[PDB]
Motif scaffolding. Structure first.
Motif: not given
Ligand code: MG
Ligand code: MG
Ligand code: MG
Ligand code: MG
Ligand code: MG
Ligand code: MG
Lengths: 638, 673
Positions: A33-37, A40, A60, A437-438, A463, B212, B219, B472-473
Motif C-alpha cells: 500500500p502507499p506509505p504514510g507521510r 516515505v 519523489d 534521553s534528554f 529533548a 512522495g 492517497y 519527553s522529559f
DNA sequence: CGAGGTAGTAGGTTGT
DNA sequence: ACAACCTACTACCTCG
DNA sequence: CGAGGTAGTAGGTTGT
DNA sequence: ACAACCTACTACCTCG
C-alpha cells in the motif's frame, strides 16, 4: 593577512563523467500500500537499494546509472513489520547539469553509490560501506589491526569525480569471548554477535534458535589491548603520502583514472597576543608573570588522603602567582570529611561564610560516583572545586600547574586575555550535551574585546540537539546582561558560535531580538568534522590557516603540534551577519587561545564553545539542581 | 482519639465463587511464528480474547472458565495459534497470586456478560443505559463504570461509579453542516488515531502534493478509505509527535472528538444522588449477571479533629488573614506593573494591603514600575533597580494574556529574582474573591507566611515530591513545610528526568535541601520528617534517602498519596463531611480531605504507609491538617496536603517556563502559586 | 581526577 | 534509510 | 491570568 | 495487553 600560501586538500580530481553518467535513467516508484507521510523517505531509500545497480532517490522517485532492464524493477519490501510491494516504471533519461547544484547533488549521490558498489566487488579487502582496509598494521593473540582509508566520492561542477580519502585503521577480533579469555584479557565493556551486528552492554533458550558465552565476539577497544604498545595517530607527512598512495590504488582498481591532487588558496592568520599581567605564550606563564585581572581571593584545601596541610610547593607557587599579580591571597583548610555526613556540609557553609571562593581537593583517584557526589555537594554550598590526585611529586609540574590554573578559573580570576582588537566584543558559544534521553542546551561567553571575562549561564533541559528558540534568546540575553553588568553598556556587536550545524531557524527569535536592541551580530556554525584534511603544498604545516572554500564556508586550522598526529581543521559556515569571513576567521582563531584551564595546549575550539561544551557535559553528569548558589564568573566545570 | 462511624464504600459483595470457578481450566499456547520474547505477554492477551469464553492470561498460558471444547482452540491472530488443555488448577483466594488470576477472570466475565445485553452502549468495563442529554449530532449517555474482582473469602466484589459519556454520531462535514464551530480535536474514521484540528484549507483534494508524489484524495482512496464515504473538504491538522508541520486531511474522513468546550449541562452529581444511583445500578447488574443480590460493603470510619488555622489570630480560611493579620509578616515592598496603560494602584487594593499589614504590625512600601516590556532590555534594567530597592514581588494588572506572553513575562521577572502575580484588569471592587486571592498569591510570592497550623504532629518537617512537565522529559521536584506549625513554606530547584521515576540521588539531594532549610530556620536537625509522594512510590525510589536519614538519626515516614483508586465513600446516615479516615489494610487507608455540597461527590485519597513506625491515625491526622496550610487559595482548601500541592504547582511552572529562570529567586517565595 | 588533540570503540539527532 | 553532523569512553604522547 | 474539586475529553509511565 | 497509577485541557458553580 600574514601570508597568502597554498594547500592540498585530501580530495583528488578523477575522470570526467562519461556522457551516459551525465544522463541517468529515471524510474517512478509505485507502492502497495502507499506509505504514510512519515515512512516515505526511508522507503524510497530502501527501494533505491533493493532495485540494485547504482540507484538513488531523486525527488519523489529514482535515478539510476543502470539501465532499468538490469534492475530489480519488481519486488517486495519489509519495514517495521509492514510489507510493501514495489514496482518501478522507467520514464526515460534526464540529463543533469553539474553546474546547477540541485542537479549536482543527485549526481553526487550516484557517485557515492558507485564507489560503494565497486568497493564490494573487490578482494581480498575488508570493506565496510565506503571504508576499505587493504593491509595489516598489527597482530597478536586473537586480534589484528587493519590499515586502509575511509572514502567518499562526489561530482564537481566541472563535471568530474572528486574523491575524498583519509587513512584509517580498524580493530578486529578473532575469537569467541570464551576463546578470547582463553588467554588473559578481562571482560570487554562491549560484545558483538556473529549472528547479528546487534551488540549490547554486557541454556534452554539458545537451543531452539540454533544460534551466553560462546555465541558472541568481543568488541575490541584500545583499553582491551593496552597490555600486549603501538599507536594509530599518523604523523602528517606519512598521512599525506598514504593518502596519495590509496587515492591512486582506487583510481586504477575502479577505473576512474589518475588522481589529480586538489589545491586551495590558504591564508596565514596573525598570531594572537596572549596576556597575563604582561605578555605570555601559554596560560601557565601567568603563574610566574601574574594574572590578567586578579582580586583578593581565598582558597581552601580538602584532603581525603589523611594528610595534614597544604603541600609546600603548591603554597609557594600560589604566593608567587599572587605576588606577581599584587593581589592578596589567603589559604584556608577544611578540617572535615564527607563521612561526617551533614557535619561536612556545615563545614563547607562556614568556609564560604568566611570568604572561601573555591576548594582544592587532594585525594586518591575516585570512583565517578564519589567524584560526582563530592563535586555536586560542594556546588550546593556555592563552592566549585578542583581535584588533584594524591600520590603527587613536585616534579609533576604540568599536572599541578594545570590543577592550579583550574582552581583559579574556578575561583573566578581572569588568568589570561587577548590584546588584539576584534569585530565583536561579546562572543558566546552554544552547545547541547548530556548522556541521556534528554539533553541540556547551554551557553558560555567571553565578554569584552580582550576576552577579559568568562561566564557560564544556567542550562535548560531539552529533548534533542535543537535548542528551543526562546531558550537560545534567553541564554543569549543572560550573556548580554553579563556584558551590561561589566561594561556598563551594551556591546556593538556579538559573535554567536554554535557547536555543529545550526538546526533550521534555531536562532530566528534571538536574531530578531538583537535587531530590535540594535546589536549587530554574526552567527557561525562550527563543525568539528566534515572539513577533511589540509596539507601544505610546500614546506611546513602550521596553525592559523584559513581556507575560503565555498562562499560563506571556510576551513580553519586552529591547533597543531608536530607530535600529535595530523590535525583536523574545523569547518565553518557564516549563517547570518555581514562581517568579512577573514575577520570571523581571525576572531575565532584567537578565541582558541583564551582558555585558562589548559596551561600548555590550546583547545581546537574557541574558548566560548569549549567552555559551553564542558558546562553542558558537567550539568548532564551532576545534574542542574546543584547550581543555584554558584557565581557565574566561577568556571566550575573546567 | 475521636469517635467512629460507619461508611458505605461503592463496592458490593456478590455471590461466592462456585466449586467450578475455583478450579479453572489451564491451557498451554503454541504460536507459529514463535513470539519475540518482548512481544509475548500482549500476544497471550490476544489469544485469550480470540479463544472466546471467559479466558485470561495465567503466567505462561491461559486459564478458562469455559471448557476447552467450547473455545476457539485453533485460529489466526505472530499469527497462528493452537491451544492444548492441560487439566484444571484449583486456586486459593487467600493466595494473592492465585487471587490475581481469579480476578482477571471476573473482569472478563463482567465484560463478556455485559456484551450479551441489549440495548445498552458498552465500552470496556463501562455501561451506559440511558440518555441524559442530546443535541443535533451529539448525545451524552448516562451509565456507570464497573470493575469486578475476587475477595479472599472467595466471593465476587462489584465496584460501581456513575459516569456520563459524550458521543459524536456525525462526520466532521455533517457536524459543521449544523453550524457547530470547529471541534478542537478530531479522529480518523478508520482508526482510533486523533488529530488536533488547526483550520480548513481552500486547497483542492484532487491536487495536493503529499510527500512522495500522491495527492490527498488518491492517497486515501488507494486505501479504500473513501470506499463508502465522501472525501469532503481539505482539513489541516496538527503534529501528534512534532511542532513545525500542519498536515492535510479530509473532512469527510474525520469525526470530531467532543469535549465540554464544544457545546447548561453539569455532569457532576450531588453525593446523595450518586449514592442512590450507584445502588440502583449495582442491584441491576447483580440481577442481570446472576451474581446474586449486592450487599454494599461497610467500613469503620473515624472523624479527625477540626484543624486550627492560624493567621495572626485564628482564622477559618486563609483570606481572613487579610483582615486579621498574617502569621508572620516582615517589612515588605511590592511593585505594580500596569499593562493596561492606566496608572497607580486601585485604591481598594491599596487599602486592603494597608489593613492587612497594619493588623500585622509590619511596614509596607508600594512601588510602581514606570516601565513596560516593549522597551526591551531597558525594562529588565528597570526590574533590576526595583529588586535593588527592595521590591520583593510584583503585581501585574493586564488584559487576559496569551500563554506565550504570560510565560515570557513571568520568566523575565523571574530572571531578576522577582515573582509576579497576574490580576486580569477589567476589575470591579465588588469582585472580592478574585482580587483577594490575587493579593494572597502576591504575599506568598513575596515570602510572607500568611497562615500556619496550631496543633501537635509527629513530624516537624513535611516534604512533598511530584513529577510533571509536558514533554519527553519531566521535572522531579520537592516542596516543604518546615516546623510543627508548618510556618515556613519552601521550594527547591527541580531536576530534569526521563519519566515518572525520580532518581535516588535526586530524591536524597532534594530531601537534603529541605533538611538544610530546617537547620537554617531552627538551628538543629529535625526529629522526624514526613515524606509524601504523589502517586505510587516507584520501587526503591527512596532507598538511598531513607538510608541517609537513618545514618543522621532522623526518623521518618514515607506515604504514597494516590489521587485516584480510592473509590467513593458515603455516610451510612447523616450528611457527609470531610476529615474522614477509613483504614482498609494494615498500612493502607482512605482519607476524605475536602468536600463541599455544591461541588459534587468527593473522591477520597488512597494512602499507603510505605515506611516508618508512626501509627496510621497519626499520619492521617497530619496529612489531613496539612491540607489546610495552602496560602494562595483563600476560600477553599486543596485536596492534597500543602507540601504536595506546592510540589505539583512547582513542577507545572518549571515545565511551563523552563528551569533557566530560577537562579536568583529565593526559595521562601512561592513564585509558582 | 591535568590538560590538549588525534587515534580507536560504541552510539544518537536532524531532515530529505 | 541515510547523509552529515553531534555524544560518550580509553590509550598514546607531550607539555605553544 | 483567582481559586478549589469534580465533571467531561485527551494522552502517558511503571511493572508483570 | 493490562492493571493501577500519573499528566493536560476546559465547563461548571461558589467562595471552609
Ligand atoms: Mg554538540
Ligand atoms: Mg557537547
Ligand atoms: Mg578540571
Ligand atoms: Mg505525579
Ligand atoms: Mg501533578
Ligand atoms: Mg497564582
Amino acid at each position: 593577512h600574514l601570508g597568502k600560501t597554498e594547500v592540498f586538500l585530501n580530495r583528488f580530481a578523477l575522470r570526467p563523467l562519461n556522457p551516459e553518467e551525465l544522463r541517468p535513467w529515471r524510474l517512478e516508484v509505485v507502492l502497495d500500500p502507499p506509505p504514510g507521510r512519515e515512512e516515505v523517505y526511508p522507503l524510497l531509500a530502501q527501494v533505491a537499494r533493493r532495485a540494485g545497480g547504482v540507484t538513488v532517490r531523486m525527488g519523489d522517485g529514482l535515478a539510476s546509472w543502470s539501465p532499468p532492464e538490469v534492475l530489480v524493477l519488481e519486488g517486495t519490501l519489509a519495514r517495521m513489520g509492514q510489507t510493501y510491494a514495489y514496482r518501478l516504471y522507467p520514464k526515460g533519461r534526464r540529463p543533469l547539469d553539474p553546474k546547477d547544484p540541485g542537479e549536482r547533488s543527485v549526481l553526487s549521490a550516484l557517485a557515492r553509490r558507485l564507489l560503494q558498489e565497486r568497493l564490494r566487488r573487490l578482494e581480498g579487502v575488508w570493506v565496510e560501506g565506503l571504508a576499505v582496509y587493504r593491509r595489516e598494521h598489527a597482530r597478536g593473540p586473537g586480534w589484528r589491526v587493519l590499515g586502509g582509508a575511509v572514502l567518499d566520492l562526489w561530482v564537481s561542477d566541472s563535471g568530474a569525480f572528486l574523491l575524498e580519502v583519509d587513512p584509517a585503521y580498524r580493530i578486529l577480533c578473532e575469537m569467541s569471548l570464551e576463546a578470547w579469555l582463553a588467554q588473559g584479557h578481562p571482560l570487554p565493556k562491549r560484545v558483538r554477535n556473529a549472528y547479528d551486528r546487534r551488540t549490547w552492554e554486557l541454556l534452554d533458550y539458545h537451543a531452539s534458535k540454533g544460534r551466553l558465552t560462546g555465541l558472541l565476539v568481543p568488541v575490541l577497544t584500545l583499553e582491551d589491548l593496552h597490555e600486549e604498545s603501538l599507536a594509530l595517530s599518523l604523523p602528517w607527512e606519512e598521512r599525506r603520502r598514504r593518502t596519495r598512495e590509496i587515492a591512486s590504488w582506487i583510481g586504477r582498481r575502479l577505473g576512474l583514472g589518475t588522481p589529480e591532487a586538489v589545491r586551495a588558496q590558504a591564508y596565514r592568520l596573525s598570531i594572537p597576543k596572549l596576556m597575563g599581567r604582561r605578555a605570555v605564550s601559554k596560560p601557565a606563564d601567568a603563574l610566574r608573570v601574574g594574572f590578567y585581572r586578579a582580586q583578593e581571593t581565598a582558597l581552601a584545601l580538602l584532603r581525603l588522603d589523611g594528610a595534614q596541610g597544604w603541600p609546600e610547593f603548591l603554597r609557594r607557587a600560589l604566593l608567587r602567582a599572587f605576588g606577581a599579580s599584587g593581589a592578596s591571597l589567603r589559604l584556608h583548610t577544611l578540617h572535615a570529611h564527607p563521612s561526617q555526613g551533614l557535619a561536612f556540609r556545615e563545614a563547607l557553609r562556614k568556609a564560604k561564610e568566611e570568604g572561601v571562593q573555591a576548594v582544592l581537593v587532594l585525594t586518591p583517584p575516585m570512583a565517578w560516583e564519589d567524584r560526582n557526589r563530592l563535586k555536586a555537594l560542594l556546588l550546593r554550598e556555592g563552592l566549585p572545586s578542583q581535584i588533584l590526585n594524591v600520590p603527587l611529586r613536585e616534579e609533576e609540574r604540568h599536572r599541578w600547574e594545570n590543577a592550579l590554573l583550574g582552581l583559579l578559573a574556578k575561583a573566578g580570576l581572569q588568568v589570561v586575555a587577548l590584546s588584539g582588537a576584534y569585530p565583536a566584543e561579546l562572543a558566546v558559544g552554544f552547545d547541547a550535551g548530556g548522556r541521556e534521553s534528554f539533553r541540556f542546551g547551554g551557553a558560555a561567553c567571553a565578554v569584552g574585546g580582550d576576552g577579559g571575562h568568562l561566564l557560564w549561564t544556567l542550562p535548560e533541559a531539552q529533548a534533542g540537539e535543537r535548542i528551543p528558540q526562546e531558550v537560545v534568546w534567553d541564554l543569549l540575553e543572560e550573556t548580554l546582561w553579563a556584558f551590561r553588568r561589566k561594561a556598563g553598556r551594551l556591546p556593538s556587536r556579538v559573535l554567536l558560535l554554535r557547536d555543529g550545524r545550526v538546526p533550521q531557524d534555531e536562532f530566528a527569535l534571538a536574531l530578531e531580538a538583537l535587531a530590535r536592541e540594535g546589536i549587530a551580530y554574526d552567527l557561525v556554525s562550527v563543525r568539528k568534522s566534515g572539513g577533511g584534511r589540509v596539507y601544505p603544498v610546500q614546506g611546513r604545516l602550521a596553525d592559523g590557516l584559513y581556507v575560503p572554500l565555498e562562499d560563506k564556508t571556510f576551513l580553519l586550522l586552529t591547533v597543531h603540534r608536530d607530535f600529535r598526529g595530523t590535525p583536523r581543521p574545523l569547518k565553518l559556515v557564516h549563517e547570518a551577519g555581514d562581517t568579512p569571513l577573514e575577520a570571523l576567521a581571525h576572531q575565532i582563531f584567537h578565541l582558541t587561545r583564551l582558555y585558562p584551564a589548559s596551561g600548555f595546549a590550546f583547545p581546537r575550539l574557541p574558548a566560548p564553545l569549549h567552555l559551553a561544551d564542558r558546562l553542558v557535559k558537567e550539568v548532564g553528569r551532576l545534574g542542574i539542581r546543584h547550581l543555584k548558589e554558584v557565581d557565574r564568573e566561577k568556571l566550575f566545570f573546567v
